[PDB]
Design a protein around this nucleic acid. Structure first.
Lengths: 129, 194, 85, 97, 121, 213, 80
RNA sequence: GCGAAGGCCGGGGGCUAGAAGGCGAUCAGACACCACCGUAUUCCCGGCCGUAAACGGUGCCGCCCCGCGGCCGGCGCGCGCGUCCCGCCGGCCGCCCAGGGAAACCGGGAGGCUCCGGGCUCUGGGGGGAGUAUGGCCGCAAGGCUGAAACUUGAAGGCAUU
RNA sequence: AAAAUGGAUAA
């Protein structure tokens, strides 16, 4: 059984960007995997994305400007205390200055900076750098 | 040019070997009754004219050196080296010609031109160590490693190697405007044959 | 484009900045050997002459080893336009 | 260390092979670890090449030829020199010599 | 059993390419004079002079008939040059090829000029 | 003479500043060139472990000595190269020569606050050589260099004075521990960040091999 | 050739497996047969793995096959 | 639930090999190896037993991952029309691009990890003592499964190079 | 065809 849609899909993005693979393919698509990609495209780590709505699992198209290093998901999706979002940042972030950890908060899918600006905490979904 | 296309079809340059790779499928054209591959000559011109274009970039054409270990060829390289201003590095490659500060044949070329990677692999390998962009001219089976560009060509007959070397040199000099400028070439197609 | 790390003042403070591969955007390495800033030459055509000034393409060291440096080139100069489709 | 990837046998996808015995040792080695080189030879030694045919009354009779596979054990073979101890580089090459 | 030492072989090669005309195919003594002729070459000791002389007489035989590589002669480079720079009296190779290969026709069709379409065919 | 095409260009001054040569990734094989390009305190050096190396042959055992030398300047430059020779001192000289050729540019970094001039490392740069796996983690201003006594001093010559390290493997090996860190320190420039993602440059006529004095 | 997955050449999708297509769907289609009294369309399953019978007749129009079903009488291509 | 081989229980069998046993040579002594003879066994039907270098010494599903291949089972499209050519899937395999690892080397993973987090399960923690003792439990037994401690010792051990 | 052995301790 495909236990996690996001992990395989994020490994596949990263796999394409080591082989260059300007055009990348994600086969199983979930709303969260779209929300992760808009967050990435808005950041600019990935250039853009789309999904071909075949009337089954909706396959996803990924376009990467090629400037990508490691993009992995953190599951088990531990909820993080708002005060200690940084301890997870120390382990998963290259430099406190750059990088992003996408969390899920009630207000909506939000990145590490937005969470501490609102002083809020959420379940870790993944790290994109 | 229809008379050069007739010459290219005469050279049998449009012939290929058994199989191609992901990169080579671009130059592939068709399958014969026996099964070796064939190449579209449009791909031959773009690659050879591109090679002419890229070859004028480095001042001191000895720096755009030529290396080959193919019996049918070497002579064509030895004719190109004469018609252009390049230096041939043929026969035994002397592995470590490019490296070794005290090498009898110290070589530091700025660009490289080969007869093909498979015939002498040391040549293409010796690009990575010495920071050198490398070019070769290959048949349908193409191990395209380290090579900026590669040109589909038979590389099976002295005549085929000769006519692509003639077409390259004619274009290299014509693209420069040094001679010909698309006029009858100063040397014949048969001059480069072994 | 203000490329490079900066202080609170905003001047580039990371000393040397490595160039980027044209096809993968990976930074050409400090001791990477295969990656090269080779130059491609345009022609007047009516002039039929080199104009002395022309574009350069950096082929990343990794792509050279991977073997895709050739198919990358046709695309690199296709967007530039000098090479045909 | 694994001297060879085949691990010394050609057993692939089965997990079992039928077992035979060395012509010499009579050691039982599964079909996969067996030399098995096919033999075809004239029944009288080629030294009696045509001496027999000149002696043979019947016209156009050809000397009978044996067509027997010889199955030897690995241990028996190296000591009878049917195959030698190859070098690390030499082991991968096949091409029956 | 006799095989020559490297010192003799190396010098002998120099003496055969320094002067092929002066050296002799069978006369060891003519070569012996050239081997020990002060400015031409010096061999310390007669036996070493004799050693080079025997080889330079055999090497003279080698150069005379089908010379092995590593030896240079004035005539050899010039004589080779004439054959390499000889182009066919008239290059009859191009002519009209005729006999079209089976699918080669499409490649000419797909580049804008037909190579005498159905004339070589 | 100057043996290399780059070596003559360096003495001539056609290509100047070590940082420019590193930018074009030109292999440097001339020892004399580094001393000419940088005369500032020459290079600070350390002789890390001259190990004893042996080959048992017939009657007795041959004993070469293998030495690893750290040569560096606190301008984001660290040099780690080694040499082995029968003479113990000669090995050190051969190592210093190697240490000159493989001097590697270190990016250097600014932490959460860019208060002044770079003393921190760039990202959590990580390199492994042998079995020793080491990650250089950026550290706060007051944090200095935390690592093995020998590994930390390699960092001081590199010029990072704000780093955190956790090397894992057979660390007792001076040969690969201080070697794995060298891979990490060089990796500093191989890594990339969003400002570095901006596409510019491609000056073309600036190729070191193209330049002729 | 800078084709990307978003628009794959039709032949590529037609060559690949009907599940491994950027748009997955039916490999099979409806192919006509000809019967007594009919010059018009007599559509049938292209890959019938079961017997179809001559309209108003006892004999079976399509032979059973794991793949596309074969026929013993005159037949008409796809849809017309 | 099934599970090689050997064992064992009750019937049968009984050719050949052949645990034991005798025997010759064999050597200092061989009661070992090599001959010769031979019971159990091998064979069969109903039972137990529950082990193996049960091996790919690589758990189980899941997904991406580079070219050259061989075989194999369906399954297609064009060619002249062949048991062709390109392949599409499920396997069987050889070489191996990345990449990994102490390396041998895996690379259809032993890759996508210190830039560590798809899920479920077992199992280990220096080397002996020790699969030992005992407490069970299962078995006709032989034994299997679970499973100690006291005590000792500085190396044991992997792949490599000379 | 027949061949077993070599104290400890440093070198």
């Amino acid at each position: 059984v495909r236990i996690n849609v996001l992990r395989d899909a994020l490994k596949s993005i990263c796999n394409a960007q080591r082989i260059g693979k300007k055009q990348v393919i994600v086969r199983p698509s979930s709303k969260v995997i779209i929300e992760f990609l808009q967050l990435m495209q808005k950041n600019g780590y990935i250039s853009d994305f789309a999904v071909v709505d075949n009337h089954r699992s909706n396959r996803i198209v990924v376009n990467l400007i090629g400037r990508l290093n490691k993009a992995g998901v953190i599951s088990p999706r531990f909820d993080i205390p708002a005060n200690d979002i940084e301890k997870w940042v120390v382990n998963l972030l290259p430099s406190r200055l750059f990088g992003h950890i996408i969390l899920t908060t009630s207000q909506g899918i939000m990145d590490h900076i937005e969470a501490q600006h609102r002083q809020i905490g959420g379940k870790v979904i993944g790290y994109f750098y | 040019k229809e008379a050069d296309v007739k010459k290219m079809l005469v050279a049998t340059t449009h012939l290929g070997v058994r199989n191609i790779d992901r990169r080579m499928q671009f130059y592939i054209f068709d399958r014969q009754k026996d099964g070796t591959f064939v190449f579209n000559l449009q791909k031959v011109w773009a690659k050879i004219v591109f090679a002419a274009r890229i070859l004028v970039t480095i001042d001191d054409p000895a720096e755009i050196a030529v290396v080959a270990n193919r019996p049918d060829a070497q002579r064509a390289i030895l004719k190109f080296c004469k018609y252009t201003h390049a230096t041939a590095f043929p026969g035994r490659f002397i592995p470590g010609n490019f490296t070794n500060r005290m090498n009898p044949n110290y070589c530091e070329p700025r660009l490289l031109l080969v007869n093909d990677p498979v015939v002498d692999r040391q040549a293409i390998l010796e690009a990575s160590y010495v920071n050198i962009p490398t070019i070769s001219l290959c048949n349908s089976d193409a191990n395209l490693k380290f090579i900026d560009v590669a040109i589909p060509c038979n590389n099976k007959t002295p005549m085929s190697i000769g006519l692509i070397y003639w077409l390259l040199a004619r274009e290299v000099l014509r693209l420069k405007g040094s001679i010909s400028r698309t006029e009858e070439w100063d040397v014949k197609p048969d001059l480069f044959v072994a | 484009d203000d490329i490079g790390m900066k202080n609170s003042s905003g001047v580039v403070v990371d000393a040397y900045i490595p160039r980027k591969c044209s096809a993968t955007n990976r930074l050409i390495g400090p001791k990477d050997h295969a990656a090269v800033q080779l130059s491609v030459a345009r022609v007047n055509d009516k002039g039929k002459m080199i104009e002395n000034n022309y574009v350069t393409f950096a082929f990343c060291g990794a792509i050279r080893s991977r073997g895709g440096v050739d198919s990358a080139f046709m695309l690199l100069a296709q967007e530039h336009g000098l090479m045909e489709r | 260390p694994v001297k060879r990837r085949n691990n010394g046998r050609s057993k692939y996808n089965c997990g079992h092979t039928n077992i035979v015995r060395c012509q010499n040792c009579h050691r039982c080695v599964p079909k996969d670890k067996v030399i098995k080189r096919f033999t075809i030879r004239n029944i009288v030694d080629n030294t009696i090449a045509d001496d027999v045919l000149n002696a043979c009354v019947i016209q156009g009779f050809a000397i009978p030829k044996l067509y027997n596979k010889v199955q030897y054990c690995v241990s028996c073979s190296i000591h009878n020199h049917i195959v030698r101890v190859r070098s690390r580089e030499d082991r991968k090459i096949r091409t029956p010599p | 059993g006799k095989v020559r030492t490297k010192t003799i072989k190396r010098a002998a090669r120099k003496i055969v390419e320094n002067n092929y005309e002066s050296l002799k195919p069978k006369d060891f003594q003519n070569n012996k004079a050239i081997c020990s002729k002060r400015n031409v070459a010096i061999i310390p000791s007669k036996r070493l002079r004799n050693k080079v002389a025997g080889y330079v007489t055999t090497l003279m035989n080698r150069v005379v008939k089908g010379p092995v590589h590593g030896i240079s002669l004035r005539l050899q480079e010039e004589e080779r040059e004439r054959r390499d720079n000889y182009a066919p009296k008239k290059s009859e190779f191009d002519v009209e090829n005729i006999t079209v290969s089976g699918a080669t026709q499409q490649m000419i069709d797909s580049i804008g000029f037909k190579c005498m379409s159905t004339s070589l065919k | 003479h100057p043996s290399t095409k780059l070596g003559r260009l360096v003495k001539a001054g056609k290509i100047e500043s070590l940082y420019d040569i590193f930018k074009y990734s030109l292999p440097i094989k001339e020892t004399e060139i580094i001393d000419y390009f940088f005369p500032k305190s020459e290079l600070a050096e350390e002789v890390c472990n001259i190990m004893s190396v042996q080959k048992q042959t017939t009657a007795g055992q041959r004993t070469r000595f293998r030495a690893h030398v750290i040569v560096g300047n606190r301008d984001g430059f660290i040099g780690y190269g080694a040499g082995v020779s029968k003479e113990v001192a000669n090995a050190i000289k051969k190592a210093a020569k190697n240490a000159r050729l493989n001097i590697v540019p270190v990016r250097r970094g600014f932490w959460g606050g860019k208060l002044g001039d770079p003393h921190t490392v760039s990202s959590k740069l990580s390199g492994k050589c042998g079995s020793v796996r080491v990650r250089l983690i950026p550290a706060p201003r007051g944090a200095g260099i935390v690592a093995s006594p020998t590994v930390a001093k390699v960092l001081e010559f590199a010029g990072v004075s704000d780093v955190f390290t956790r090397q894992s493997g057979h660390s007792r090996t001076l040969m690969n521990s201080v070697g794995a860190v060298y891979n990490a320190l060089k990796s500093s420039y191989s890594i990339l960040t969003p400002d570095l993602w901006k596409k510019e440059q491609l000056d073309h006529v600036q190729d070191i091999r193209t330049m002729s004095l | 050739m800078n084709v990307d997955l978003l628009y794959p050449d039709p032949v590529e999708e037609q060559r690949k497996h009907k599940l491994k297509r950027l748009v997955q769907g039916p490999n099979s289609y409806f192919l006509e047969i000809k019967c007594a009294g009919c010059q018009d369309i007599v559509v049938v399953y292209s890959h019938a793995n079961t017997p179809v019978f001559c309209p108003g007749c006892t004999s079976q129009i399509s032979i059973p096959t794991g793949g596309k079903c074969a026929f013993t009488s005159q037949v008409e291509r796809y849809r017309q």
